[PDB]
């Protein structure tokens, strides 16, 4: 991603404010509530049959934590996003056959949970820095598309 220095400070500054194990959970349940075709891929996770059931689901919460953790790792490797996400794009492509368009949709739902949780601190500038990162991670999880 080409982040200036003012943008990288705005991203790492914003990220110290994130409760990783609250954000990731809320972002994977809304992905499942808001774009129902994604439910198909987590159906081994239980009752995803309505908003409160996705949102109250143990495995949705624990797996969202894992998802937002991968973001954190990737945040201290912005110059080498591809290589930090290479094994994970093999998981998503080869084994899971998740269409790349959904990497982008989960990227933007995490941008909505962050604005919901931080309010004024998730200003238009911070969002713009952060949209670049979400595009880079989306492209990095799609590099191994065999």
């Amino acid at each position: 991603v080409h982040l200036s220095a003012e943008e990288k400070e705005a991203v790492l500054g914003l990220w110290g404010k994130v409760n990783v194990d609250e954000v990731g959970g809320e972002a994977l349940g809304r992905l499942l509530v808001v774009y129902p075709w994604t439910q198909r891929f987590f159906e081994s996770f239980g009752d995803l049959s309505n908003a409160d059931a996705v949102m109250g689901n143990p495995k949705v919460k624990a797996h969202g934590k894992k998802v937002l953790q991968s973001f954190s790792d990737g945040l201290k490797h912005l110059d080498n996003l591809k290589g930090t996400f290479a094994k994970l794009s093999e998981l998503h492509c080869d084994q899971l056959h998740v269409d790349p368009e959904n990497f982008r949709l989960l990227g933007n739902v995490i941008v909505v949970v962050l604005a919901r949780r931080l309010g004024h601190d998730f200003n238009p500038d911070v969002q713009a820095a952060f949209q670049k990162v979400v595009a880079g991670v989306a492209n990095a999880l799609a590099h191994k598309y065999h």
Binding site: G29, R30, V33, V34, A51, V54, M55, N108, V111, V112, V113, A115, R116, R117, L118, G119, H120, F122, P124, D125, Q127, A128, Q131
Partner: protein, 141 residues
């Protein structure tokens, strides 16, 4: 059209936004200009600095168009007629820019109303903006 649950969520959620409709459309256009710079080309006549007056004024016009459409959720094609031909035919707006503005309206609304943006409201407001975008992009298809 929207299901009856969706219409009810859209109407209450946009109903309690109230007077802030203008301000949210303004901040939605700022977050799309900054976040997605290719969209700045449709607005060269404008001044696009934070707090610009043209951006504030045009932000009210966008929100008033979304209140007319929350008002006529079943007259949605008839309601937005002038606006579908002004966007597709006259301004030739690329389809994807409507998916980007819609994203910046859901981010603006989450930021200002954390309380109210529960997951079902979020789902009803996305289907509401995807069907508003289909009406505006209808001369293309």
């Amino acid at each position: 059209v929207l299901s009856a649950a969706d219409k009810a969520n859209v109407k209450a959620a946009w109903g309690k936004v109230g007077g802030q409709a203008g301000a949210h459309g303004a901040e939605a256009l700022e977050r799309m200009f900054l976040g997605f710079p290719t969209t700045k080309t449709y607005f060269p006549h404008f001044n696009l600095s934070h707090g610009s007056d043209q951006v504030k004024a045009h932000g009210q016009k966008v929100a008033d168009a979304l209140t007319k459409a929350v008002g006529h959720l079943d007259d949605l094609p008839g309601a937005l007629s002038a606006l579908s031909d002004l966007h597709a035919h006259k301004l030739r707006v690329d389809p994807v820019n409507f998916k980007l503005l819609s994203h910046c309206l859901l981010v603006t609304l989450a930021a200002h109303h954390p309380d109210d943006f529960n997951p079902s409201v979020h789902a009803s407001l996305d289907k509401f903006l995807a069907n508003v975008s289909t009406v505006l992009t209808s001369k293309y298809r």
